[PDB]
Copies of this chain bind each other. A is one copy, B any other.
């Protein structure tokens, strides 16, 4: 029984795909443990979530996009939640994300990709404590 951190990005709200994305996870039978809505995440919170990408050239545009609209932070719980939800998510690249996945079906840009999902146990614990410090 694992717990994973998921972010509904600003492009979801702009395109009205919020329920679509959450429904795909809900239908997979994953249970919401914690959920927080942000009218606008603080840039610092974002920079922390993506601290691994600070040296990348897209870092600043990435941070700019993540504060350009509302965000929903969610902790999903279930057996092997981390890897499973990653597979539902789909590849970061629009040239690779398979049809049937969230990105494969709905995302068309490598930056604006609708959804974040922790990629491992270590980073899950880490990202859960960033969005739900309590």
Q: How far is the CA of A39 from the CA of B107 in the complex (A)?
A: 24
Residues in B neighbouring A99, C-beta threshold 8 A: 87-88, 90, 98, 100-101, 104
* A80 at interface by CB-CB < 8 Å: yes
Q: How far is the CA of A78 from the CA of B70 in the complex (A)?
A: 16
Contact of A108 among B30, B37, B94 (CB under 8 A): B30
Tell which of A12-20, A50-58, A119-127 binds the partner. A12-20
Docked complex: A93-134 residues within 8 A CB-CB of B = 94-95, 98-101, 104-109
Docked complex: A18-57 residues within 8 A CB-CB of B = 18-20, 22-24, 26-37, 39
Interface size grouping (class) on chain A: 35 or more
Residues in B neighbouring A16, C-beta threshold 8 A: 15, 26-27, 29
On whether the beta carbons of B79 and A94 are closer than 8 Å, the reply is: yes
Q: Which residues of A contact B (CB under 8 A)?
A: 13, 15-16, 18-20, 22-24, 26-37, 39, 70, 72, 78-80, 83-84, 87-88, 90, 94-95, 98-101, 104-109
6 of the cross-chain contacts (CB-CB < 8 Å) are: A18-B22, A18-B26, A28-B108, A29-B108, A33-B39, A100-B101
The 6 closest A-B CB pairs, nearest first, are A100-B100, A19-B23, A35-B37, A99-B100, A29-B108, A19-B19
